[PDB]
Amino acid sequence: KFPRVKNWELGSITYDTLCAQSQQDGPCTPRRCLGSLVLPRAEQLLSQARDFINQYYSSIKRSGSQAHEERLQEVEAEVASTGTYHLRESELVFGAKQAWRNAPRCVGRIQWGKLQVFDARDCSSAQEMFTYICNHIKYATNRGNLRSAITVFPQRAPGRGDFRIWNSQLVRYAGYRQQDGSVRGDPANVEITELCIQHGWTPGNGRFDVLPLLLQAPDEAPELFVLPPELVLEVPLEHPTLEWFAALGLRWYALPAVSNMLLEIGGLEFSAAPFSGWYMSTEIGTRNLCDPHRYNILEDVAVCMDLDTRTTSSLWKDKAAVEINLAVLHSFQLAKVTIVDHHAATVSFMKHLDNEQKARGGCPADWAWIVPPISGSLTPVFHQEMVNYILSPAFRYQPDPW
Amino acid sequence: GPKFPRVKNWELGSITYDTLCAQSQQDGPCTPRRCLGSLVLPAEQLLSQARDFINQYYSSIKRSGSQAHEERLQEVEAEVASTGTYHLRESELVFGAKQAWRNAPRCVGRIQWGKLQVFDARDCSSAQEMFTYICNHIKYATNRGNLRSAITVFPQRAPGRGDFRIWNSQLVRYAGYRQQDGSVRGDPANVEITELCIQHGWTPGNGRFDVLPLLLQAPDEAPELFVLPPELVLEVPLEHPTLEWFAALGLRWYALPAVSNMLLEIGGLEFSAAPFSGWYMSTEIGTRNLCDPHRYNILEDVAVCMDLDTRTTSSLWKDKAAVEINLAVLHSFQLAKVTIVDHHAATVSFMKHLDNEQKARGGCPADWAWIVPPISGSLTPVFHQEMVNYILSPAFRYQPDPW
Numbered sequence: 001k002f003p004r005v006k007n008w009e010l011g012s013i014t015y016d017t018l019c020a021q022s023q024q025d026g027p028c029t030p031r032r033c034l035g036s037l038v039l040p041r042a043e044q045l046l047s048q049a050r051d052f053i054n055q056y057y058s059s060i061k062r063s064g065s066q067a068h069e070e071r072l073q074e075v076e077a078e079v080a081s082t083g084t085y086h087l088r089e090s091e092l093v094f095g096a097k098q099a100w101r102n103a104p105r106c107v108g109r110i111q112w113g114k115l116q117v118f119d120a121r122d123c124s125s126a127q128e129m130f131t132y133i134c135n136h137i138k139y140a141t142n143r144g145n146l147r148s149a150i151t152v153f154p155q156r157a158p159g160r161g162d163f164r165i166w167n168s169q170l171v172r173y174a175g176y177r178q179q180d181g182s183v184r185g186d187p188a189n190v191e192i193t194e195l196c197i198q199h200g201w202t203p204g205n206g207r208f209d210v211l212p213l214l215l216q217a218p219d220e221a222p223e224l225f226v227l228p229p230e231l232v233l234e235v236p237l238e239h240p241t242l243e244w245f246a247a248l249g250l251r252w253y254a255l256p257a258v259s260n261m262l263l264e265i266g267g268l269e270f271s272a273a274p275f276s277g278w279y280m281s282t283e284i285g286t287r288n289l290c291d292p293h294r295y296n297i298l299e300d301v302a303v304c305m306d307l308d309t310r311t312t313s314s315l316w317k318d319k320a321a322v323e324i325n326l327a328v329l330h331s332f333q334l335a336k337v338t339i340v341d342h343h344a345a346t347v348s349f350m351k352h353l354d355n356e357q358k359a360r361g362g363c364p365a366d367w368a369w370i371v372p373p374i375s376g377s378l379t380p381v382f383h384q385e386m387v388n389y390i391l392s393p394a395f396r397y398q399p400d401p402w
Numbered sequence: 403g404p405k406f407p408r409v410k411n412w413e414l415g416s417i418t419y420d421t422l423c424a425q426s427q428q429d430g431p432c433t434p435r436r437c438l439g440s441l442v443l444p445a446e447q448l449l450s451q452a453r454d455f456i457n458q459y460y461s462s463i464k465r466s467g468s469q470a471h472e473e474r475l476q477e478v479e480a481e482v483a484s485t486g487t488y489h490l491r492e493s494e495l496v497f498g499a500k501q502a503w504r505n506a507p508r509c510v511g512r513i514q515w516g517k518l519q520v521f522d523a524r525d526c527s528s529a530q531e532m533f534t535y536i537c538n539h540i541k542y543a544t545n546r547g548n549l550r551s552a553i554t555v556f557p558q559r560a561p562g563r564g565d566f567r568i569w570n571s572q573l574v575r576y577a578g579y580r581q582q583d584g585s586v587r588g589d590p591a592n593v594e595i596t597e598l599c600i601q602h603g604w605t606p607g608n609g610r611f612d613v614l615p616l617l618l619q620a621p622d623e624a625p626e627l628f629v630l631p632p633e634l635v636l637e638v639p640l641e642h643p644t645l646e647w648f649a650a651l652g653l654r655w656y657a658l659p660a661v662s663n664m665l666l667e668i669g670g671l672e673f674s675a676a677p678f679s680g681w682y683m684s685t686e687i688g689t690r691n692l693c694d695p696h697r698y699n700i701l702e703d704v705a706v707c708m709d710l711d712t713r714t715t716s717s718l719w720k721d722k723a724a725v726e727i728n729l730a731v732l733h734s735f736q737l738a739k740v741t742i743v744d745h746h747a748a749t750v751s752f753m754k755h756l757d758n759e760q761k762a763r764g765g766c767p768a769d770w771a772w773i774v775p776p777i778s779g780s781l782t783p784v785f786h787q788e789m790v791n792y793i794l795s796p797a798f799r800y801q802p803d804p805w
């Protein structure tokens with residue numbers, strides 16, 4: 001019933017009792033494990049609402065109190081007559097922090113308690129969404145001293161369209177499909193780039209053109225907004241000892257801000273609730289720059305390093321990858337922009353695991369996502385068994401609005 | 403769409419559906435409530451398992467429903483009927499052993515599955531004879547550096563009688579000597595088997611790479627100790643292609659990886675002693691065996707020799723040192739003409755295996771956490787391939803230590 005969890009480097013054992021609190025099914029069954037797959041293939045609401053309110057009052061050490069009992073009545077009254085309800089700002093703040101804390105694929109959760117929550121539920125137009133987004137970016141960027149934040153737009157409502165941010169992140173580089181099939185820029189963003197153009201954006205022709213935002217108010221066509229360049233901090237990439245690296249003209253933006261995930265709290269759903277923390281260097285240096293379906297610069301860098309790209313056995317791919325990740329760290333450090341390397345991040349996650357074991361009896365974690373894309377076993381998390389399950393409040397994927 | 407798991411490759415955008423998982427008859431550790439995919443170790447019945455295996459065998463030779471098939475099924479039911487168990491024919495053992503390998507979710511080398519050399523040692527009746535069979539396996543498999551995959555199958559577990567067992571986890575292992583200061587000289591992973599060898603009369607050495615003797619156990623007898631003739635255990639001294647000082651570290655590793663404590667299950671029959679061997683994927687040695695903190699842990703030593711800043715994580719000193727250590731392993735095995743496969747070549751071959759199996763059986767059970775190499779994960783194609791994990795039989799399974 002309760003899984004035994006072992007760390008093979010230290011030989012230590014724990015038991016995950018928190019998983020018993022999961023109310024939502026994942027993709028696995030006793031016949032087959034689908035743990036490596038990326039995407040999944042009124043009384044109910046009232047049930048989730050009560051559970052959430054209970055979590056909230058327990059967090060402020062006031063369960064059973066009068067305020068607790070009265071709040072539960074309010075929620076019951078609102079759902080019974082309207083089919084839905086609304087969260088108080090303090091609950092929204094607690095809810096967003098818990099969603100982060102519960103996110104199995106996030107290795108930066110040691111920071112979960114420090115999140116600036118912007119209540120944007122009084123938003124009635126895409127124009128207003130844009131203003132809130134600009135303020136989020138300014139605050140979060142903070143001149144390179146990044147601060148974790150989330151801006152929460154109006155919840156979903158029955159028979160009414162959702163407030164949505166079409167872009168997957170607030171800052172993304174365009175991907176222009178070229179005549180000969182290739183892509184200029186970021187291949188992951190070809191679809192959104194095209195949508196922007198289709199909606200009147202005058203495209204650029206570079207490899208790092210910041211995309212405009214396509215923001216959508218309920219039941220309206222999305223609207224295009226160009227981000228003020230001075231609000232988008234970027235870091236030109238250079239290498240500490242390889243002088244020619246800068247000549248590659250590579251760069252990446254400072255702020256990672258997921259904008260297409262749904263935040264679920266107490267049964268309520270927030271379809272637009274962009275959040276941001278700071279990058280772990282491998283996200284940029286390894287995946288964004290070296291993925292074959294992304295900027296795919298490994299071969300170029302290897303040739304500049306004059307490595308033997310003739311055979312795999314020369315480990316040219318491994319050598320180039322390391323220097324690229326080193327360039328990212330060096331460059332962010334030089335530009336004085338917050339970033340965390342994969343060793344420091346995983347070491348902090350092990351502390352988080354321990355903190356959560358004591359606090360809640362476990363921590364849902366997705367091993368395939370927590371272990372870094374390079375040097376996996378050189379990090380502590382590789383040797384740590386993990387149990388994955390869904391807790392609520394939660395961040396979850398949702399269909400693209402188009 | 404299809405009511406089977408949909409599997410996507412994110413690098414290529416391609417999709418397949420796994421229908422082979424429908425054939426699984428054993429539950430894994432996961433439930434809809436929680437995934438335990440990252441955990442390392444998470445007559446009526448015999449007849450059904452036996453019948454299923456016979457059906458698999460006849461299906462494989464394209465004779466399902468034939469007179470021979472029905473007669474073999476009859477024969478197995480009667481043998482189990484009067485004796486409680488049954489025995490496999492030679493070709494059934496060969497088919498079952500290859501299928502067990504083919505079915506192994508944690509093995510990235512499965513493209514080679516059809517080439518296994520199956521040594522039938524089911525006539526073995528003593529520990530001394532087990533040793534002879536094992537030495538022949540080592541000689542055949544090593545083939546002076548041009549390694550050949552092989553498995554030697556000893557007698558199956560029998561009702562009442564004791565089990566045939568090889569106590570060591572691999573045929574070649576380096577001793578791990580517990581020190582006064584509490585540290586370990588040699589391989590920390592082998593501290594327990596090393597002590598057991600000593601408790602059984604082995605006179606211990608005092609080096610970092612002392613090859614351990616084998617503790618072989620015949621039915622209902624105490625284990626017997628046998629030391630492998632040095633001439634038979636091929637080793638490779640490690641040197642680096644450019645860093646001249648690497649050779650001075652005195653590191654080395656043996657050529658033959660030969661798992662000896664896994665149980666081979668075929669049609670319900672259990673072969674407690676069936677050592678198998680292929681060849682190493684370089685990261686097993688260069689990354690795990692040499693750099694794991696709980697193994698040889700040589701990362702800091704090598705980083706210091708490379709004059710890296712081991713004071714801060716940000717210098718990526720662990721990453722740089724690990725890459726050079728893996729390169730030294732590949733370079734040295736290549737120099738010594740001993741078969742080895744780097745993690746890029748191996749994962750590329752595994753992607754081909756997945757495509758072959760998609761066509762041949764409708765899927766391939768695979769454990770993502772084990773298939774993706776310990777270094778440079780996303781630089782290999784398997785990192786971007788979703789995988790379905792499930793248990794198929796014949797199979798190789800873990801079994802408790804005999805002591």
Ligand code: HEM
Pocket residue numbers: 096100103105106107108109111115148149150258275276277278279280283340345369395
């Ligand atoms: C403070 C610094 C933070 C760091 C260093 C960090 C790091 C990471 C990393 C490396 C991943 C995997 C990303 C990928 O491979 O695409 C991730 C995923 C995630 N993080 Fe964090 N994180 C941080 C802050 C946040 C914040 C502020 C939230 C939400 C309030 C959050 C929510 C999540 C979620 C939900 C995912 C999964 C996204 C997906 O499935 O695509 N993270 N994080």
Ligand code: HEM
Pocket residue numbers: 499503506508509510511512514518551552553661678679680681682683686743748772798
């Ligand atoms: C021909 C070359 C082969 C290569 C390169 C290869 C490579 C690998 C690798 C890299 C692993 C993971 C090992 C670890 O991380 O400890 C593995 C595991 C495994 N392989 Fe293969 N393998 C080969 C041949 C074989 C053969 C001949 C068999 C059996 C007939 C086999 C059965 C298995 C099994 C059952 C495991 C899992 C062992 C465990 O769970 O500890 N492999 N293989």
Ligand SMILES: N=C(NCCC[C@H](N)CN(O)CCN)N[N+](=O)[O-]
Pocket residue numbers: 168169256257258260261275276277278279280283397
């Ligand atoms: N450091 C962070 N990295 C997350 C960015 C990409 C992630 N795949 C989200 N995403 O695109 C989800 C949509 N499929 N987060 N952060 O600090 O806020």
Ligand SMILES: N=C(NCCC[C@H](N)CN(O)CCN)N[N+](=O)[O-]
Pocket residue numbers: 571572659660661662663664678679680681682683686800
């Ligand atoms: N390349 C190979 N590597 C096998 C390494 C040991 C593995 N951990 C099994 N093992 O010792 C199981 C014990 N718990 N195999 N081979 O080629 O035959």
Ligand SMILES: C[C@H](O)[C@H](O)[C@H]1CNc2nc(N)[nH]c(=O)c2N1
Pocket residue numbers: 036037038368369370412785786787788789
């Ligand atoms: C197929 C496989 O699940 C997929 O490539 C996963 C693996 N681990 C990952 N881990 C992180 N952090 N981010 C990712 O995008 C992925 N991709």
Ligand SMILES: C[C@H](O)[C@H](O)[C@H]1CNc2nc(N)[nH]c(=O)c2N1
Pocket residue numbers: 008382383384385386440441442771772773
């Ligand atoms: C805890 C975690 O499951 C464990 O460290 C696994 C991860 N992946 C692995 N993969 C391979 N090939 N071999 C291993 O020993 C491991 N160890």
Ligand SMILES: [Zn+2]
Pocket residue numbers: 028032033034035432433436437438439
């Ligand atoms: Zn699972």
